[PDB]
Amino acid sequence: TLMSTLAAGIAGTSLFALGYIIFTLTMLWSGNNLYVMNSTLRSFEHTLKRWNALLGYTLFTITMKVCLQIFGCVFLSWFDQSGGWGKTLCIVRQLFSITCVNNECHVLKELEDFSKACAVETKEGNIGFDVIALSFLVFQIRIFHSWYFQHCMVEYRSEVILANRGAVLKNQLIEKEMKEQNEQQKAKFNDIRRRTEAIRERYQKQIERGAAERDFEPVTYGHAKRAGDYYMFKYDPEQQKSSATRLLNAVVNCIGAHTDILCYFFAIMTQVMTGGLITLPLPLMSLFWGNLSNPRPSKFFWVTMITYTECVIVIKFVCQFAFMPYNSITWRTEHQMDPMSLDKLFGVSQRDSFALWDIVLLFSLFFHRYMLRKLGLWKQSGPIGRFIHQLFHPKFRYIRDLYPIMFGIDVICFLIMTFGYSAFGEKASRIPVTLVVMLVGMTLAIIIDRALYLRKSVVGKLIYQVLMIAFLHIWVFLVLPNMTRRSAISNHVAQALYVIKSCYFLVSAWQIRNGYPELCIGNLLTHSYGMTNMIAFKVFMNIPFLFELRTAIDWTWTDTSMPLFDFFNMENFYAHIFNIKCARQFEAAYPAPRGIPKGKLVKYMMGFPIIIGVVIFIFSPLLLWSLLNQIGTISMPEKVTLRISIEGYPPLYEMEAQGSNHDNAELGMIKPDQLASLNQALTDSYTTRDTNSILRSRMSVSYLKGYTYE
C-alpha cells in the first residue's frame, strides 16, 4: 500500500503529489511501531485515524483533480492575462498541473500561445497511479478491520520486543558456526600436513632403498629437477517439509539474509537509471563505508541512507515541476545533445518513463531496517581507526572462495564491453583510441585482480577496489558522456557494464570482508572430472593467449621454487594429464560394449555432421565468392551531347538532347518494329558464294542479337 501511494505521489507533479510523499514518509517512517496497542494511549485508534486521514487526503486530491479538469478545459481563459499577476497564475497553473486530459474535447484554438508559455504535458492531469494507490489503500483499510490483523498484532505485540533474545540466540548460533568452521580448518590443516609428511616419508624411504644406484647428490636446482631415476619408482603404486516448498523456503530465507546486498544492488540500479550528482552519494557511501563494513553496517549508516534517500526523492520531485526552465520543452530541446548539461549532470529531467527504482530503493531500505528491528540487531584511534581495525581483524567471519564468481562477472563485463563497442565511440561509426585504451585498462584490471588474489593481499585488494569504484563512477558518469556525446540515460550498454562492474564490486567487498581463503585452492576448473569440465578446459586451452596468461600470472604471483619455462612445462603436463583423466572418466560414465560394433544410428548422426560440415567448409569460399561476384546493372544513359568543331577552336556545331521517359522524340528507345527491320536487313546482307560474307553475317548478327531492345 505504501509502495502504491509513494509511486502515485512521485509520478505526479503537484503539491498534491508532495502531500503523497510527506504522508507516506510519515507512515513508513514509523514502520510497524504504530501497528501496536502499547501503553493503552489510543495507539491503534490513532493508527486507524491516520490511515483514514490518508484516505481522506487521497479523496480530497481526486476531487481536486476532477474539479480542475473543467477548470483547465473551459476556465483556462482566465489564465490568459498579462505579465506579473498573469505570470504568477501561469506558474500556479504549472504547479497544480491544471491541464486537459479528456482528449475528445476540442482544442482551444485562440489560446495556443499561452500553452506555449506554460507548457504542461498531457499525462499529468490524469490520475492512474492515483486510482491504483486508492485501490491498495482502501483494501488495506478493509484489512485493518479484519480478524486476521488481530493475529498480525499478536505477532507484532509482545513478540517484536523479543528481538533482544533473538539477537542473543543468533549470536550464539553464529559463534557455534565459527567454532565449527575453525575445527574444520584445523582438521584440514592436519590432513594437509599428514599428506605432506607421508609424501616426504615415501620419498625418503625410496631413496634409502635406492642408495645403491644413487651416485649423484644434487647440489643445484637443475640437478634436483633432473635426478629422476628408477630407484624412485621401485614400489607398487598404492503442504509439509516436502520438496514442493523447498524453493520457496530457500528463496525467502536467502532474501531475508541478504536484504543488505539486495539494497546495495537496488542502489546501483537507481544510480544507473538516474545518472547524476544528486544520486552518486548513495552507491559511493554504501560501497565505501557500509558495504565493506566487516560487521553489519551500524545504525548510523542505515539512518543516513534513509534520510538522504528521502531528501533526494523530495528534490527530484520538486525538480519534476515546470516553473523551473530546464524542465520546459524549449530548454530540453535546446540542450539534449550535450550530456554534461546541468539538468543531466545533476540527474534531473522530464523522465517520461516512470522512475520506479527509487521507490523500491526506499522500500528495500525500510525493509532491511524492519528486519534489523525484528532481530534486535538494529540497535581509540577514532571511528575510522576502529573501522579499519574491525575490518582487518574479523571477530565474526566466514570462509569461502568467491574468485570464480568475480572472474565470471568481470569476464562478462569485458565481453559486453568489446561487443557493445559501438556506443563507446561515436556517420563517424569508426573505432576510437579511447576504445582500445579502455580495453587495455580493463585487461590490466583483470591482471591486477588475479595478482591480488594470488598474493592474498587484503589491503591491496581493498585499495584497488576503492580506486576501481572511484574510477568506474567518475569515468562512466563524466568522461564517457563527454567523449561519446551520449547521455548516461541513453547509454544502455554502458549502463549494463556499470551494473555488472558494481556486482563485481559487491562480490569483491564480500571477499574483502570475509578475508582471502588461505586454504588450498587449485585451478578452480579441474576440481571435478566431467564432460562439462572437459569442454570448459578444452575451450580454455584452445583459446589462444589465455592459457599462458593465466600460467605466467600464477607463476609470478605465487611462491614456487621452479623457473618460468619449467612452470609452463608443468602446467602443460597438468593440462594433458587432467584431459586424459577426464576422458577416462567420461568413457567410464558412458561405457561401450566389447565385441558389439557401434550402432548404425550413432554412426549416422555422428557422420552426417562432420562430412556435411567439412564439405560445406570446402565449398563455402566459392559460395561466398559466387554470392559476392554478382553482375551489376546500369540504367540507360541520361544525357548525350554532340560537338562538331575545327581542331582547337570553338564548337562549330554542338548538340545535346536527352530525356529518358520513353516519350521523348529525340532520345527515344528503339521500337521493336525498327529493331526487327534492322535485324532483318543485317541478316539479308550476304552473298551466295564468298563465305567471307557468310562469316561476317555470322559475327554481325551475333553482335546485334546479344543486346535486347531495352
Place this chain on the structure above:
Amino acid sequence: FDFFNMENFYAHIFNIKCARQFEAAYPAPRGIPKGKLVKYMMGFPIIIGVVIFIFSPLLLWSLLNQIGTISMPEKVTLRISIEGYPPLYEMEAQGSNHDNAELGMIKPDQLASLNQALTDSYTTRDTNSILRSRMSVSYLKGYTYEDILIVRFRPESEIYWPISQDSRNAMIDKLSRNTSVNFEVSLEFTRPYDPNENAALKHSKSWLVPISLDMTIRAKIQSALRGDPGHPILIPQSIPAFIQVPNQGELTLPTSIGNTIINDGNPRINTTGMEKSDEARAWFDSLTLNLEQGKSQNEKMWIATSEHPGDQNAKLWIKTANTTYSGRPYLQVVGFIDRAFPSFLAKVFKGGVIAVYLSVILVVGRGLVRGIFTTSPSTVMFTELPNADHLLKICLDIYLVREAKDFMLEQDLFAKLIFLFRSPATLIEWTRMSK
C-alpha cells in the same frame, strides 16, 4: 635426408649441452624459491609484451583509421534550364575569404535565429510535431557555424540566353503538344582540391520539375519563351533553400527540416495526395523567371525570384538581402557541409578486418607460442637430458670420422646414434651425469 637428420640431431644435442653448461655456470639453489626480484623483471617484460602484442593491431588500426577533413566548398554554381536545352538561367558565385557578399559563412546571430525558429515550430498536442522538432533540431545542431555557408546567387542572368532562334522555335513547338518536358534545376557544389585524396570533389543534384499538361499554362510558357513581356515562367517547388553538402555524395536534402517545413508551419501544405518522390520536394521554393529583352532579341536575359512555400514571412526562412546594384532579392541556398571522410573505411568494412585479426591471432598463437613456448609431452624425453656429454661425444666422433676421410665407421656410429634416439631405455642409461 639422413644428413639433414644428423645435422638436426647435432643441433638438438649441442643446444641441450649448451643449456646444461649455462645452467652450471649460473646454478640455482635447491629448496629456496626464485627470488621475487627475478620473478618481477622476468614477468613484467613477457606479460607487457604479450598484452601489447594483443592490442597492437587495434592500436595501429586506431592510429590509422583517423577522421579526415575537407575545407569548405570553394565554387558553387546554379543552372536553370528546360530539359535538353541551354541553361535558361545559370549562376556561379564563389569566394571563401569570409568577406564575400555572395558566398558568405553563416553569421552566429543568423544561425541562432534559425535554430530558435526551428525549435519553436511545434504544437501543444500532436506529439508527431514533437518528434519532428526532435529530429530537426538534432540534425541542425550537429553542424557548427563553420560548416554552414550562406550561398546567395544573383537574380540577373550570368550570360545572355544563348539559344538559337531555330532551337528556340523547337522549344516553343515542343511545349505546344501533349509531349511532357521537365524543367531542369541543377546546382553544383565544387570543393577545393585536396592533395590527400587528389580528386576535385564536385557535388551536383538535378531536380526535374514536370510541366502541367494544361494548355493554358503551356500557352503562357510558350508566349514567355517567345519574348512577349508580362508572362512569367512559373516553376513550382523546384529549388530547396536548405542543402546538405556531404563528403562524396549528391546534395542530400535535409529531410527532417523538410518535414518540419511541410507539416509544422501554420500554412500547412496540402500534401495528402502526392507521389512519394514529389512530396519530398513539397517544401522547395518556387522561382519565377522573367525574360528581359531590353534591346533587340539578341540580348535575352532571365531574372529569377524565389518565393518560399506556405508562408514567406515565417521565421524559419533566412532573409534575402536585396541586390546592392539593382535592387532585387538574392537567391539564397543554405548549405549544410560535412567535413569528415573515411580514410579507408576499414577497407570496405564487411567484418573481414575483425575476421583477419582473429585469424592472425589464432595462427600466430598456435604456431609460435604453443610450439616454441610449451614443450610437447613427447619432447620432454629428449629436451630434459641430465648429461648430454656422451651424446655430444658420439656426434663429434662421427664428425671427426667423416672429416678424417673415413666412412667405414661413420655409418656404424650413425646407427649407434639412431638406436640411442630410438630406445629410450638406452637413452636413460647413456645420459646419467658423471658416475
Place this chain on the structure above:
Amino acid sequence: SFLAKVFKGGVIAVYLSVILVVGRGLVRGIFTTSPSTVMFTELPNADHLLKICLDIYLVREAKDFMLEQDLFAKLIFLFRSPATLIEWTRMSK
C-alpha cells in the same frame, strides 16, 4: 563489382593456399594423433599421474619447496622413461 580484385589467378592461389594451411594446421594436428603422441594420449589409468601432480600442487600451496623439485623430477622421469610410464599407469591392480 570487384572483377575478382583485378583477377590474376591470385584468388584461386589464395584459396588453395588457405585450404592448405587450414588443413595442415588444424585437421592433421588436432584430428589425427601423431605416432609419438599415442605413447602419452592413450594411457589406461592416469589416476597415479594426476595424484602425483596434485601432490606437487599441494606441496607448492603448502609453502613447501623441498619436496616440489623432487616430485617434479619424479614427473619428468615418468614422462622420460616409457617403461616406467607403462609400469605406473596400469589400471587398479
